[PDB]
Design a protein around this ligand. Structure first.
Ligand SMILES: [Mg+2]
Ligand SMILES: [Mg+2]
Ligand SMILES: [Mg+2]
Lengths: 231, 204, 233, 240, 211, 244, 5, 195, 235, 222, 5
């Protein structure tokens, strides 16, 4: 009300309204799902279009050969944060000849988002990210929120009607976690998960966006006729 | 490539009875080549006279700089700067360029308008003040001027007598130096009149 | 621009079937003066790497502090700091190799020659060299200073190429290193008798040996050498 | 440094600071530009509430940017000087690098660019100035007349007016100016310019300034008597 | 060795194709003429890297001019962009000797000599490089304004060949260009290996050499 | 942050006016009246001191009339402290020009640069403008005798006779009435005093409440002299014109 | 190094 | 760059400047104009380091032309010379100084007098009846000391100048390919085409 | 007042949403992408009949293979074009090749959100960026001040956008010829334009692989306008 | 005074065929009269069918290869995984080298691969970024020995058709991958014999449309 | 300079 003018102000109940308004931008964003087994980690993203004449907004970005994320909210903010991750992943490779740990990737994003919430003039990031990766400690899935809170999960979903997919994964947890050495079956579980967040619209060939990383699989994105298999 | 002895030139200042004299040669050259026989090295800011020897570009620069500073001084103080005060200003300004100095040998001369005391002073290129009762010398024939002044000079000379002494000191000194001469100028300064005389000297 | 003041001489090393051996004498020379005698020039990083450093000792002590700080920094927000996400010899080397070249590029080098000896997580032997110029190379045998001229020839008679590494045991490999340290004591004027030796095995782990001495030296033949040519007494 | 965003969007999609800068132009004395077949004429109003003025030394309303280009304006007088100075520096800078004087379009584009920069730079307000930039491109005999405004938009005009009661004199020019046949001579172009100002000014004494620009750096400012002859001629023809 | 001279039929530009590192012949297949645009040519003499980098950079600056101004850059403006650039680097050790040759409507055929110590000269004839003197010797003694396009092309070719022969640091092959009101026209790569003997036999010149 | 407390000094009103410049002019309108009158053979500067106290030292005082160089002077109206900042800048600018070109600065060039500084404070920096209006009285070998005025807007204009500060409306009407082009300095002196005498908010105009200065060619042959009038000299000129 | 007609 | 001369006579200033531009053992050009018009009644000839000369001349030209537009007024030759000297006086204590020597020939319209200023690269200004830069002076100064009179006409000045060029062509080691002569008077600047 | 980089309770940047309102006031610009080329057309909208319409430059060349049409506060577009042209030429200098139309658009859209308390406010102009490259062929992009860009088969921006976009929805198919596309831009422009469409108050342009980016002459467009009217009367 | 440069010796060789290109380099690394390594590879697969070697000062060589490999990675990120053409790579490397014009990379750079018409391409760079496409280039310590042999055997220089009175030149033709590897092996054995800094091992990288193949051969170790 | 007990 009187305490939402900028990010530097606390409310009388100890809330940061600008950070909460940035969180609101994610809820308006198109649904995206993350889930992993022990061998592979999968991103499934429902892409959104302006109209039938427009293209479908690309949701998934590659960060390294072994790491990348899906976005929900302000796409330009995702570009800034993904570019930062690319540089940090790259710094780790050139200086230490070392693939950046997915956990450190989270810690670096958390600290970058935080600085924008404590200083005058700046604003919070208006996007949520699902980071997947395969490092020295196996498969990983992270959920980034622009409050700074990063969380490691087995599966999750962010965006509009993400509660449907998040409930499904919470039921399916015991099944999909043990889909080891089977990429196509882990994707199928992810495609069935995002399907619980659909209303009136269904998954089409230029609508669905899938990405996978694993043990003997570099981070690769599937769009167009390559995802026709999973409809 | 010695900045102080490219252009050449000399300044000498003497004190008399209730008067001061400052004199300079008119030569500006480029080593062996004589270029100008009209290059005066004595300037004045109110009743305070400044003679500058050394690198000609710095002589011109410092004249313009001290005109600048004495003009602002007069506007704020609402009075003409005195020789004792101006001497301190020159010293301050030269030392401000301690590690990139003006290649000059300045000489202040004038009569304090309040006390009526004759005043002369000399400086090195980094602004060390050399105050004197008798005389100050500067330029490429400083050795010659020191020898002439030390022998010829006597205290409490009348303005007319003082003129003859300072003139003979400059002329004979300038004739033993290759880079000095080509005409000379003598300022006789009394309390409230100043006479400026151009000397006839050998033009080689 | 530097000049080295207090200096350490040769660091020698070689691979064997199961791991790597590295050795360096305990001397801190001040020009011709053999000033300091208690100087450790082998610095372990975790339980799987040893960094042997020759050249300027002030810059060596700076590199010690960097490696010490690297272990601390790696442990931060790292539950697997003593497991999968522990510091590898390859990580430690590449970091030093980056610093050494960055410093030479700013015309202010760390006046050192460094050999990073260790065993990787997959059991592979790691042995690589870096110096003040940021020049890096790897070989079955690596040595610095006089070691490069005198030790390498002796160590290469044991492991001449890659195929000789599985055929070389830790007993044979250590014997060659200890022999090389004796030859350096004979012929290097800025060497000492006292030295340290470190073995990093993929099975038995890190073995750090201190206060070793050169022994079984041949000096007896000296008594028979009289004059510089014609002298018979 | 002072960083405040003074020029910002409003809910209805307007930048009020830019639109309030136009109100400052609308307050300013009337300025008119009319280009003929072989010339451009810049007419300027001078308000007659100021007597005991010294017209020798008082800043002239029309300013030379180079020997071949001129700039008149309407709005804040102090603001105009900053644009004129920048334009004059850019004029000499162009000659130095391109070894050729600026085109009227290029000089306009630059000035318009400066005005635009102040509409989305922090700590600054827009220029309370609209300019009429007229002249002839090097080795060219085609007349050029351009207009700029605080927003930073610029465009070419056959004839245009800016300042107070500019909508009245624009109404006059719109019916009196023929595109197919512009003023064929200097006299015709000056007369149409004076006529257009006489719709607004008051008296044709020391209230109207006229500047004529011709090809190959041929610029001259008319005196009181020269302008007064046009005023006397128009009024006699009017009584009909 | 590079040269360009102005005549009745426009501008002729001739360059050798040799690059040397000390006394070592590094290459005999180097382009020393950069085609900035259909009406602009740039010659290269000095440091290969300095010329190659800054003249391709000049081509970018000339493209940005015609995008901004909706008009092809003048030979004067183009040459002065390069001369003002190298002048900023004066004393840094840049070693370039170039000639900006082109046609525009306002200028006509124009040649500008631009070197790394900031010298910029408009002129009708220039020879630049280690063998510039050898090229001058033949060019000057045979040059007239009223040369034909055929004779002008040959003289330009023959002047490089003369230098390619005598100058140890010039040779490889001759690259010919003819600049007209319609733009530049390439007149082929001519290997000195075959050209020398062809010229010697047909012309009856080079009597110093064992036939 | 600090946005909350920013007055935004450099913005436009809906009507297209600069709030702070308008309020700075309202401030100046309460300052003691200053008059400049330009004659054919010199310029007069007359200024009324702000309600004087009997125990104010009058002879060693400077409030209104300041010297920029040997050829140019200014009459001040508004905040004196603000004026002295601008005067010291103007004095330096004059010396910079002399140092560069070995010639005394033309009057308009000094006026323009001082006016350009004022303009800067209205467009950028987020600082309040200088609450000062100047009357520039000066001579150069190009235009001869010149009067200018600058105000907080940074706009300057040339004049034959002009008033700044209080009662300019009444003062400008009286000047416009009695001024003519073939006027002498001695006549302009009388006009200046007579105008102040009628427009003054005081009971009677006296020597102790006035600052007076002339810029004549009254020196010996083709050179300009600046005369800042002493208290006794103002007392004499006030009797000579029959005001006291 | 660097090549230098 | 090598030979630049200047002769102030009764009613005009005459500047003579060599046409040769030499680099190494090659005369690249024999028609070079080593001068820029700073204003309608002010001309500046220049000689010194390659590149610096033209870069400096054009920089001054741009500054004087900017002043002329701003004030709608021509600066006096004395004022221009003082500006140029200060730029060189700044330059000499820069990271890389301008190695340029200039002559400024101008006609003061207010005084109705011709004025010749000689300024070296150090910023050393002198007003002279006749001036020269480089080795030229070592011949021309002694020659002009003899033959020069202050009340000479422009035609007498050109004959006096021919006498200088002849002496230089006889005794100077380098071929400077003759001179471009320009006259500055009350009617502005014009070039003598046949010299 | 309030901050410039402030979020609304709905989760949108106030200044970005307000800049979109400014673009709706702007003159209409239409782009249609075909397999034979991409067509760009704009409403000039001269404020007065004395204004020389040919000086209204709302279609602009970025490189030989990329064109650009604008709508909104057109003055703001100058620095966006300047950046786009530099980006296009700079990439050619670094990589000796033409730059991808998408990569160019992304470079322009990076400027968009570089505002706050960088420039003082967002851009008040939308761009239609049309071009061709070897990889993705003929492309049309809509670059907003939000920092977002969509690829379009056809797109209208400005005052008559929603009315024109609904018309483009029906008319567009994948087998449109260049000539068909040219007429379709003129047809839809004439429908949404206030004043009657002619060659002086409307401008056409296109980008083809062969001839690159070309702004049409008033003579060429006038014939296409006459061809358009005849074909509508023919049924 | 500290000298930031050093000579790590060795030599490299790039030959281009019709539908293939080879980049060869000896595996010996030296300083002064000492051998550092008998197998230290300096020919690298940089992705997008581009092989690269920066011979001379190994520290500057490694730094350059590292920066170019990184340049290829960011080219994919910024331009939608577009394949970096050999001609585009060459221009990019010129800017890397000339970027340090006043503190040069003390290396002779050679890249090899296929042009956009699928034909074999070899580009060679000087230390400050001057580059040129060629059929043939030797670089490094033994460049002066190998290069004139390549002129004779690859480009058939000074070779005339027998009995044609030295009038008809030997006609240019593309060499088979078999014939090229023969020339590379004979070039390096010849260079090893007469140059002290060349020997130990030879590593050839062959680039076809199918990908990047490797071949290794022993050289004399004296 | 320079004066220097
Ligand atoms: Mg003498
Ligand atoms: Mg003598
Ligand atoms: Mg050997």
């Amino acid at each position: 009300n009187n305490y939402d003018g900028d990010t530097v102000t606390f409310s009388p109940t100890g809330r940061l309204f600008q950070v909460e308004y940035a969180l609101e931008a994610i809820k308006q964003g198109s649904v995206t799902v993350g889930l992993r087994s022990n061998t592979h980690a999968v991103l499934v993203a429902l892409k959104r279009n302006a109209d039938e004449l427009s293209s479908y907004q690309k949701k998934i970005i590659k960060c390294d050969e072994h790491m990348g994320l899906s976005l929900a909210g302000l796409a330009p903010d995702a570009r800034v944060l993904s570019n930062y991750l690319r540089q940090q992943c790259n710094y780790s490779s050139l200086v230490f000849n070392r693939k950046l740990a997915v956990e450190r990737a989270g810690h670096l994003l958390c600290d970058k988002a935080q600085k924008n919430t404590q200083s005058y003039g700046g604003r919070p990031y208006g996007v949520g990210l699902l980071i997947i990766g395969y490092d020295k400690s196996g498969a990983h899935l992270l959920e980034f929120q622009p409050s700074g809170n990063v969380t490691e999960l087995y599966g999750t979903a962010i965006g509009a009607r993400s509660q449907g997919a998040k409930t499904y994964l919470e039921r399916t947890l015991d099944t999909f976690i043990k889909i080891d050495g089977n990429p196509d079956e882990l994707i199928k579980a992810g495609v069935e998960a995002i399907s619980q967040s659909l209303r009136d619209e269904s998954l089409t060939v230029d609508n669905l966006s899938i990405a996978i990383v694993g043990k003997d699989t570099p981070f690769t994105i599937y769009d167009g006729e390559a995802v026709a298999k999973y409809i | 490539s010695d900045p102080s002895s490219i252009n050449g030139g000399i300044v000498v200042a003497m004190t008399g009875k209730d008067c001061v004299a400052i004199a300079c040669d008119l030569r500006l050259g480029s080593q062996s080549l004589g270029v100008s026989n009209k290059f005066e090295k004595i300037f004045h800011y109110g009743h305070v006279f400044l003679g500058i020897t050394g690198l000609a570009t710095d002589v011109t620069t410092l004249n313009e700089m001290f005109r600048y500073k004495t003009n602002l001084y007069k506007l704020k103080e609402e009075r003409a700067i005195e020789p004792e005060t101006f001497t301190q200003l020159v010293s301050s300004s030269l030392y401000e360029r301690r590690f990139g100095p003006y290649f000059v040998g300045p000489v202040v001369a004038g009569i304090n308008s309040k006390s009526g005391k004759p005043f002369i002073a000399g400086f090195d290129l980094i602004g060390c003040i050399d105050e004197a009762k008798d005389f100050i010398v500067s330029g490429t024939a400083s050795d010659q001027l020191f020898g002439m002044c030390e022998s010829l000079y006597e205290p409490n000379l009348e303005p007319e007598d003082l003129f003859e002494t300072i003139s003979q000191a400059l002329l004979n000194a300038a004739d033993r130096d290759a880079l000095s001469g080509w005409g000379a100028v003598v300022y006789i300064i009394k309390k409230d009149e100043v006479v400026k005389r151009y000397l006839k000297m050998r033009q080689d | 621009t530097q000049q080295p003041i207090v200096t350490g001489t040769s660091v020698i090393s070689m691979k064997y079937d199961n791991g790597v051996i590295i050795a360096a004498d305990n001397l801190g020379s001040y020009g011709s003066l053999l000033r300091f005698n208690g100087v450790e020039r082998l610095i372990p990083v975790g339980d799987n790497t040893v960094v042997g450093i020759s050249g300027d000792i002030s810059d060596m002590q700076h590199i010690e502090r960097l490696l010490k700080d690297l272990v601390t920094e790696n442990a931060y927000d790292n539950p697997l700091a003593d497991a999968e996400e522990a510091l590898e010899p390859s990580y430690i080397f590449e970091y030093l190799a980056t610093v050494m070249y960055q410093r030479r590029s700013k015309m202010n080098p760390l006046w050192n020659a460094i050999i990073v000896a260790g065993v990787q997580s997959n059991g592979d032997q790691f042995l690589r060299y870096v110096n003040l110029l940021g020049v890096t190379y790897s070989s079955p045998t690596l040595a610095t200073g006089f070691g490069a001229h005198m030790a390498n020839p002796l160590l290469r008679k044991v492991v001449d190429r890659e195929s000789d590494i599985p055929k070389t045991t830790v007993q044979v490999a250590e014997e060659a290193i200890v022999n090389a340290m004796r030859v350096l004591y004979y012929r290097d004027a800025r060497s000492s008798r006292n030295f340290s030796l470190a073995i990093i095995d993929k099975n038995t782990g890190l073995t750090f040996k201190k206060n070793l001495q050169v022994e079984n030296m041949k000096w007896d033949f000296a008594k028979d050498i009289k004059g510089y040519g014609t002298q018979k007494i | 440094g002072y960083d405040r965003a003074l020029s910002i969007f409003s809910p209805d999609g307007h930048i009020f600071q830019v639109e309030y800068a136009l109100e400052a132009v609308k307050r300013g004395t009337c300025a008119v530009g009319v280009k003929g077949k072989n010339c451009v004429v810049l007419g300027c109003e001078r308000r007659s509430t100021l007597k005991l003025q010294d017209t020798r030394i008082t800043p002239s309303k029309v300013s030379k940017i180079d020997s071949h280009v001129v700039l008149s304006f309407s709005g804040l007088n102090a603001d105009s000087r900053i644009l004129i100075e920048k334009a004059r520096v850019e004029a000499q800078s162009h000659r130095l690098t391109l070894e050729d004087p600026v085109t009227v379009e290029y000089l306009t584009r630059y000035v318009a660019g400066v005005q635009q920069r102040y509409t989305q730079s922090g700590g600054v307000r827009p220029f309370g100035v609209s300019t009429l930039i007229a002249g002839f491109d090097p080795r060219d005999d085609e007349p050029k007349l351009y207009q700029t405004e605080p927003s930073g938009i610029y465009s070419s005009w056959s004839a245009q007016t800016i300042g107070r009661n500019s909508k009245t004199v624009r109404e006059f020019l719109e019916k009196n100016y023929d595109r197919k046949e512009p003023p064929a001579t200097v006299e015709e172009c000056v007369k149409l310019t004076v006529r257009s100002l006489l719709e607004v000014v008051q008296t044709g004494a020391k209230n109207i300034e006229i500047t004529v620009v011709k090809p190959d750096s041929d610029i001259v400012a008319l005196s009181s008597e020269e302008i007064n002859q046009y005023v006397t001629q128009i009024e006699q023809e009017k009584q009909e | 060795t590079t040269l360009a001279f102005r005549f009745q039929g426009g501008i002729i530009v001739a360059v050798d194709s040799r690059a040397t590192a000390g006394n070592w012949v590094a290459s005999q297949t180097v382009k020393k003429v950069i085609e900035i645009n259909p009406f602009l040519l740039g010659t290269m003499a000095g440091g290969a890297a300095d010329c190659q980098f800054w003249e391709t950079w000049l081509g970018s600056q000339c493209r940005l001019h015609e995008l901004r101004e909706k008009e092809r850059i003048s030979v004067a403006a183009a040459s002065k962009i390069l001369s003002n650039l190298v002048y900023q680097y004066k004393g840094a050790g840049l070693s370039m000797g170039t000639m900006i040759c082109g046609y525009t409507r306002k200028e006509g055929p124009t040649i500008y000599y631009v070197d790394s110590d900031g010298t910029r000269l408009k002129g009708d004839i220039f020879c630049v490089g280690s063998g510039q003197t050898f090229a001058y010797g033949v060019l000057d003694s045979n040059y007239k304004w009223d040369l034909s396009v055929e004779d002008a092309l040959y003289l330009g070719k023959r002047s490089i060949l003369a230098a390619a022969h005598r100058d140890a640091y010039s040779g490889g092959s001759v690259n010919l260009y003819h600049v007209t009101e319609d733009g530049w026209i390439y007149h082929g790569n001519h290997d000195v290996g075959e050209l020398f003997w062809k010229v010697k036999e047909e012309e009856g010149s080079f009597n110093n050499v064992i036939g | 942050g600090s946005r909350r407390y920013d007055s935004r000094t450099t913005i436009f009103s809906p009507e297209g006016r600069l709030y702070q410049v308008e309020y700075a002019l309202e401030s100046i309108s309460h300052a003691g009246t200053a008059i400049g009158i330009m004659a054919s053979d010199g310029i007069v500067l007359a200024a009324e001191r702000k309600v004087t106290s009997t125990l104010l030292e009058q002879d060693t005082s400077t409030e209104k009339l300041y010297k920029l160089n040997d050829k140019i002077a200014v009459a001040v109206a508004g905040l004196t402290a603000d004026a002295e900042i601008l005067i010291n800048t103007a004095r330096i600018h004059a010396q910079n020009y002399l140092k560069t070109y070995n010639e005394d600065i033309p009057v308009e060039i000094l006026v323009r640069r001082l006016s350009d500084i004022k303009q800067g404070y209205t467009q950028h920096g987020g600082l309040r403008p200088f609450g000062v209006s100047f009357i520039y009285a000066g001579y150069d070998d190009r235009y001869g005798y010149q009067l200018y005025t600058s105000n907080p807007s940074g706009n300057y204009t040339g004049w034959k006779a002009i008033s700044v500060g209080a009662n300019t409306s009444a003062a400008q009407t009286l000047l416009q009435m009695d001024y003519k082009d073939d006027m002498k300095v001695d006549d302009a002196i009388e006009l200046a005093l007579k105008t102040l005498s009628k427009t003054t908010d005081s009971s009677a105009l006296t020597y102790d409440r006035l600052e007076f200065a002339t810029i004549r060619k009254g020196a010996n042959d083709g050179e300009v002299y600046q005369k800042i009038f002493k208290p006794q000299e103002i007392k004499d000129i006030l009797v000579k014109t029959g005001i006291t | 190094x660097f090549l230098x007609x | 760059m090598d030979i630049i001369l200047g002769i102030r006579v009764q009613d005009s200033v005459i500047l003579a400047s060599s046409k040769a531009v030499t680099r190494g053992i090659s005369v690249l050009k024999d028609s070079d104009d080593k001068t820029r018009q700073l204003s309608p009644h002010t001309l500046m000839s220049f000689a010194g380091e390659a590149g610096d000369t033209v870069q400096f001349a054009e920089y001054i030209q741009a500054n004087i032309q900017l002043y002329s537009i701003r004030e709608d007024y021509e600066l006096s030759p004395q004022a221009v010379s003082s500006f140029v000297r200060q730029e060189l006086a700044k330059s000499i204590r820069s990271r890389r100084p301008y190695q340029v020597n200039v002559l400024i020939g101008g006609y003061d319209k207010k005084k109705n007098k011709p004025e010749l200023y000689q300024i070296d690269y150090l910023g050393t200004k002198v007003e002279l009846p006749y001036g020269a830069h480089g080795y030229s002076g070592f011949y021309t100064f002694s020659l002009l000391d003899h033959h020069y009179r202050p009340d000479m006409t422009t035609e007498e000045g050109l004959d006096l100048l021919k006498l200088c060029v002849q002496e230089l062509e006889k005794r100077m080691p380098m071929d400077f390919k003759g001179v471009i002569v320009k006259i500055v008077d009350k009617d502005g600047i014009r070039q003598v085409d046949d010299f | 007042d309030r901050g410039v980089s402030t979020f609304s309770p709905e989760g949108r940047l106030f200044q970005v949403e307000y800049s979109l309102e400014a673009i709706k006031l702007g003159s209409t610009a239409i782009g249609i992408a075909t397999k034979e080329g991409v067509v760009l057309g704009v409403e000039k909208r001269a404020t007065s009949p004395l204004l020389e319409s040919d000086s209204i430059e709302k279609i602009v060349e970025i490189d030989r293979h990329i064109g650009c049409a604008m709508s909104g506060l057109t003055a703001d577009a100058r620095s966006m074009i300047e950046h786009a042209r530099t980006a296009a030429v700079t990439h050619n200098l670094y990589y000796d090749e033409d730059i991808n139309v998408e990569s160019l658009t992304q470079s322009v859209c990076d400027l968009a959100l570089r505002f706050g308390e960088l420039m003082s406010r967002p851009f008040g102009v939308a761009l239609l960026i049309a071009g061709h490259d070897a990889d993705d062929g003929y492309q049309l992009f809509h670059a907003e001040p939000s920092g977002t860009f969509y690829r379009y088969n056809a797109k209208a921006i400005g005052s008559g956008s929603e009315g024109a976009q609904a018309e483009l929805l029906n008319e567009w198919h994948s087998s449109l010829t260049l000539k068909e596309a040219e007429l379709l831009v003129l047809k839809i422009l004439k429908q949404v334009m206030e004043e009657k469409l002619d060659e002086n108050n409307a401008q056409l342009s296109c980008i083809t692989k062969q001839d690159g980016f070309k702004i049409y002459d008033n003579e060429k467009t006038a014939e296409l306008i006459k061809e358009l009217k005849e074909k509508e009367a023919a049924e | 005074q500290f000298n930031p440069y050093g000579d790590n010796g060795g030599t490299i060789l790039g030959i281009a065929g019709e539908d293939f290109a080879v980049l060869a380099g000896d595996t010996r690394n030296i300083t002064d009269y000492s051998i550092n390594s008998r197998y230290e590879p300096k020919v690298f697969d940089c992705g997008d069918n581009i092989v690269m070697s920066a011979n001379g000062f190994a520290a500057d060589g490694d730094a350059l290869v590292k920066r170019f490999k990184n340049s290829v990675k960011w080219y994919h990120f910024d331009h939608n995984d577009k394949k970096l053409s050999i001609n585009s790579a060459a221009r990019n490397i010129q800017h890397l080298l000339y970027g340090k014009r006043f503190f040069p990379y003390y290396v002779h750079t050679i890249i090899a691969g296929l042009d956009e018409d699928g034909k074999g391409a070899v580009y060679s760079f000087d230390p400050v970024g001057s580059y040129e496409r060629e059929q043939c280039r030797a670089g490094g310590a033994a460049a002066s020995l190998i290069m004139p042999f390549l002129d004779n055997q690859v480009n058939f220089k000074n070779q005339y058709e027998p009995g044609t009175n030295g009038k008809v030149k030997k006609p240019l033709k593309y060499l088979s991958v078999e014939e090229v590897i023969k020339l590379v092996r004979d070039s390096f054995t010849s260079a090893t014999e007469r140059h002290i800094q060349v020997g130990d091992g030879l590593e050839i990288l062959i680039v076809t449309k199918d990908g990047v193949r490797k071949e290794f051969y022993e050289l004399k170790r004296d």
